[PDB]
Amino acid sequence: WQENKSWNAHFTEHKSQGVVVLWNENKQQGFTNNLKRANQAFLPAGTFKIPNSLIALDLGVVKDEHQVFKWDGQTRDIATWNRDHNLITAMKYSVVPVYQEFARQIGEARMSKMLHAFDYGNEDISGNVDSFWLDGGIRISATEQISFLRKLYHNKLHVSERSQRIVKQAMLTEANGDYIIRAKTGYSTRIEPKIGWWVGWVELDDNVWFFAMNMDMPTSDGLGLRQAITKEVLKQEKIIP
Amino acid sequence: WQENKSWNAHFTEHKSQGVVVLWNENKQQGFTNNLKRANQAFLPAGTFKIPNSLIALDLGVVKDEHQVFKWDGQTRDIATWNRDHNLITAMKYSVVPVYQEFARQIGEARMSKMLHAFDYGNEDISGNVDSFWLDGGIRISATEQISFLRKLYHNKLHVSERSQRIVKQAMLTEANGDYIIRAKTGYSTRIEPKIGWWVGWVELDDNVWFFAMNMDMPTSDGLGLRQAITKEVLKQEKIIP
Numbered sequence: 001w002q003e004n005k006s007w008n009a010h011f012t013e014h015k016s017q018g019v020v021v022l023w024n025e026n027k028q029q030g031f032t033n034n035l036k037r038a039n040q041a042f043l044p045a046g047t048f049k050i051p052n053s054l055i056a057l058d059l060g061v062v063k064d065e066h067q068v069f070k071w072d073g074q075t076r077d078i079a080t081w082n083r084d085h086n087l088i089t090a091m092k093y094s095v096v097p098v099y100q101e102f103a104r105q106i107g108e109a110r111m112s113k114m115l116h117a118f119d120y121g122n123e124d125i126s127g128n129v130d131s132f133w134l135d136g137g138i139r140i141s142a143t144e145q146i147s148f149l150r151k152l153y154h155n156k157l158h159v160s161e162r163s164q165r166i167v168k169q170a171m172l173t174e175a176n177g178d179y180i181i182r183a184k185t186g187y188s189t190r191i192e193p194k195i196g197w198w199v200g201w202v203e204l205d206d207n208v209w210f211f212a213m214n215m216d217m218p219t220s221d222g223l224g225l226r227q228a229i230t231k232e233v234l235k236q237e238k239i240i241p
Numbered sequence: 242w243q244e245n246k247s248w249n250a251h252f253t254e255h256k257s258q259g260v261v262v263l264w265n266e267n268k269q270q271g272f273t274n275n276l277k278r279a280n281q282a283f284l285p286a287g288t289f290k291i292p293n294s295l296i297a298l299d300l301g302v303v304k305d306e307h308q309v310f311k312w313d314g315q316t317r318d319i320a321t322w323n324r325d326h327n328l329i330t331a332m333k334y335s336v337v338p339v340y341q342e343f344a345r346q347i348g349e350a351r352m353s354k355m356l357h358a359f360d361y362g363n364e365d366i367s368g369n370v371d372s373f374w375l376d377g378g379i380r381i382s383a384t385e386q387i388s389f390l391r392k393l394y395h396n397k398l399h400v401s402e403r404s405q406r407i408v409k410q411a412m413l414t415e416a417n418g419d420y421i422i423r424a425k426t427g428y429s430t431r432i433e434p435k436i437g438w439w440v441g442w443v444e445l446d447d448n449v450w451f452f453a454m455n456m457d458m459p460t461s462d463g464l465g466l467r468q469a470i471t472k473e474v475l476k477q478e479k480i481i482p
Contacts, residue, residue, distance in 0.1 A: 089446050092418075165406050175416035205330050 007033035010232045011215065014225050018195075018215025020233045021142040023150070025208040031237070032142075041121060041139035042214060046094045046186030047197045048133035050152070053087060053167045055114045056102040058159035062087055065166050069098045091170045094185060100130040117158040120148060135190035145199040145212035153201060153208065171200060179204055179240050183211075187223060194218055198226040202239060209239050248274035251473040252456070255466050259436070259456020261474045262383040264391065266449045272478075273383070282362060282380035283455060287335045287427030288438045289374035291393070294328060294408045296355045297343040299400035303328055306407050310339045332411045335426065341371040358399035361389060376431040386440040386453035394442060394449060412441060420445055420481050426467060428458065435459055439467040443480055450480050 011018055011033075019037040023030050032038040056062040065087040075082055080093040090098040103111065108129045115123045121144050127136020140148075151157045155164045171182035183200025196217035201210040213230050217223065234240045248261055252274070260278040264271050273279040297303040306328040316323050321334040331339040344352065349370040356364045362385050368377020381389075389398075393409065396402045412423035424441025437458040442451040454471050458464060475481045 088444075092446070162403065162406075165403075165410075169406070169410065172413075172416055172421065175413055175421075180413065180416075203329075205333075 001030040001032070001035065003033065003035050004031055005033055007233050007236070010229045010236075014222075014229065016215050016222065016225055016229065018213060018229070019142055020211065020213040020230055021146060022233070022237065022239075023146050023210040025150070025153075025210065026206070030143075030146075033233075037214075038143050039141045041141040041144070042193075042195050042197075043135070043188040043191060044121065044133050044138060044140045044145075044186055045188035045197060047140075047145065047184050047199050048138070048186070049091055049094065049099055050167060050171065050184050050199075051115065051118055051120055051148070052099050052102055052106075052133070053091065053170060054118075054152075054157065054159050054163050055106055055111065057087075057163035057166055058114075059106060059110065061102055061105040065170060069095075069101070072097060087166070087170050091184065094187075096134075103130050103132075114159075118148060118151075120144075131190075134188070142199075142212035142214055145197075146210045149199060149201060149210050149212070153210070173200065185223075185226060187217060187220065189217075196223055196226045198230055202234065204239070209234070242271040242273065242276065244274070244276045245272055246274050248474050248477070251470050251477075255463070255470065257456050257458075257463060257466055257470070259454060259470070260383055261454040261471055262387060262452065263474070263478070263480075264387045264451040266391070266394075266451065267447070271384070271387075274474075278455075279383045282382040282385065283434075283436055283438075284376070284429040284432060285362065285374050285379060285381050285386075285427055286429035286438060287337075288381075288386065288425050288440050289379070289427070290332055290335065290340055291408060291412065291425050291440075292356065292359055292361055292389070293340050293343055293347075293374075294332065294411060295359075295393075295398065295400050295404050296347050296352065298328075298404040298407055299355075300347060300351065302343055302346045306411060310336075310342070313338065328407065328411050332425065335428075337375075344371040344373075355399075359389060359392075361385075375429070383440075383453040383455055386438075387451045390440060390442060390451050390453070394451070414441070424452075426464075428461060428464065430461075437464055437467045439471055443475060445480070450475070 019034045021032040021038045069085045071083050081095050085095050085098055112125050121140030124137040125132050132138055155161045168182055173183045174181040180203040186197030188195050194217050195214045197214050199212040201208050260275040262273040262279045310326050312324055322336050326336050326339055353366050362381025365378040366373050373379055392398045393405055396405045414424045415422040421444040427438035429436050435458050436455045438455050440453040442449050
C-alpha cells in the first residue's frame with residue numbers, strides 16, 4: 001500500500017475532505033490519499049444494495065433483473081421512487097423502499113449468515129432488519145469495500161455465479177471505448193458523520209482498477225463531487241483519459 | 242411495420258445508402274426507412290461474432306470471458322489483433338483469427354445445428370467452417386438480426402442462460418445515465434456488395450429498442466457512419482438525447 005497525498009488537492013479544490021482508495025488488480029498494489037481513513041468503517045448506506053441484491057437473487061426473492069417491483073403507492077421525497085422498478089432501475093435510482101422489501105423477505109437469520117459468508121465489513125446486522133445498513137450496527141471501511149468487490153468481480157462470493165453476474169450488470173454506470181465503470185453510490189445521513197460513498201471498479205482492456213471512496217457530505221448538494229473527485233484521481237493516475 | 246423515409250434524409254447528408262430498422266419492444270412495433278432493404282439478406286461478417294461467441298461458450302470452447310486467447314505469432318494488418326485477447330477484447334476489436342479458431346473447434350456439424358436452433362438467417366454454413374460468415378453461404382437480413390437479438394435479450398436462444406449473459410456483457414458498447422447500447426459491428430467486403438453492419442439494442446429505464454442497420458461501404462473510412470447515422474435516427478425518434 002502506498003499513500004499519495006497529492007490527491008488531497010482534488011478534495012481541497014472542492015472544500016471537501018475524504019478518502020479515495022484504488023487497487024490495481026494486475027499489480028496487486030493499493031493507493032490511497034489517507035491510509036487511516038481508508039480503514040475507517042462507516043455505515044454502507046446505498047452501497048449495501050450490492051450485497052442485498054446478491055442475497056435477494058440467490059434466495060429467489062428476486063427472480064431476475066426484469067421482474068417488476070410495484071410501487072407501494074406511498075409518495076416519498078425522491079420522485080424516481082414513486083413508480084415501478086426492476087433491479088436495474090432500483091439500483092440506478094437507489095430505491096430504498098424496494099430494498100427494504102428485499103431485506104424483510106430475506107430475514108434476519110439469512111441476512112446474518114450471508115454477511116458472514118461475504119465477510120462484509122463487521123458482519124453486524126444489529127438494528128432493524130429493514131434499515132440496519134442505514135442506522136444499525138453494520139460498518140464497512142473503504143478497503144473492506146474493495147475486498148468485497150474483488151470477490152464479486154471474480155465471482156468468488158458464496159452465492160451463485162448467476163447472482164453475481166446479474167448484480168455486476170446492474171452496477172453498470174458508464175461505458176465507452178476506453179473503460180467500463182460498474183459502481184454503486186451511497187449517502188449515509190441517519191447517523192453522524194454524514195458521508196457519501198462511491199465504490200466499484202473501472203474495467204480496462206488489460207486491467208481492472210477497483211476503487212472505494214467516501215467523503216464528508218453535510219448536504220446533498222455536494223453528492224456529485226463523489227464521482228467528480230474520484231474521476232479526477234483516476235485521470236491523474238492515467239487510468240482513464 | 243411502418244416505413245419512414247424521413248430517415249433517408251440522414252443517409253443523403255453523407256451520400257451513403259443503407260437501411261436502419263428499429264423495434265420498440267414495449268409496443269411490439271417495427272420501423273424502417275427501407276422496407277425492402279430491411280428484408281434483404283447479407284453476409285453477417287463481424288456481427289456473426291455474436292452467435293459464434295454464444296456457441297463457443299455453450300460448448301466449452303471458451304471457458305469464460307477472462308480466458309486468454311494467446312496471439313498465434315503471425316503479425317496481421319490490424320495492430321490490435323497482434324496481441325492476446327479475451328472474449329471482451331476479441332469482440333471489441335473484431336479479432337477475426339480468434340473467432341476462426343472458435344469456428345474450427347466448434348466444427349461444422351455443431352455449428353450448423355446451432356444456427357438452426359438460432360434460426361440464424363438462412364441457416365446455411367456452406368463454405369469454409371472458419372470463414373463462411375465472411376465468404377460463404379450464410380445470409381441474414383436486418384429484420385432477421387432483430388428477431389435473433391430479441392431472443393438473446395430474453396435468454397430464449399437454445400443455449401445456457403449463462404452463455405447469453407456473458408455474450409450480452411461482451412456486446413456492451415456504450416452506457417451513461419440515459420441509455421445502454423449493446424451492439425456489434427461488421428464489415429462485409431470479401432463478396433459484393435461491400436456493406437457495413439451495426440446491430441444491437443438500446444436499453445432505457447422503461448423500454449428496449451432493438452436496432453439493425455447496414456449500408457453500402459465502398460471504402461472503410463466511412464465505417465464510422467454506421468454508428469453516426471443510427472444515432473441520428475435514434476435522436477430523431479427521441480430514443481436517446
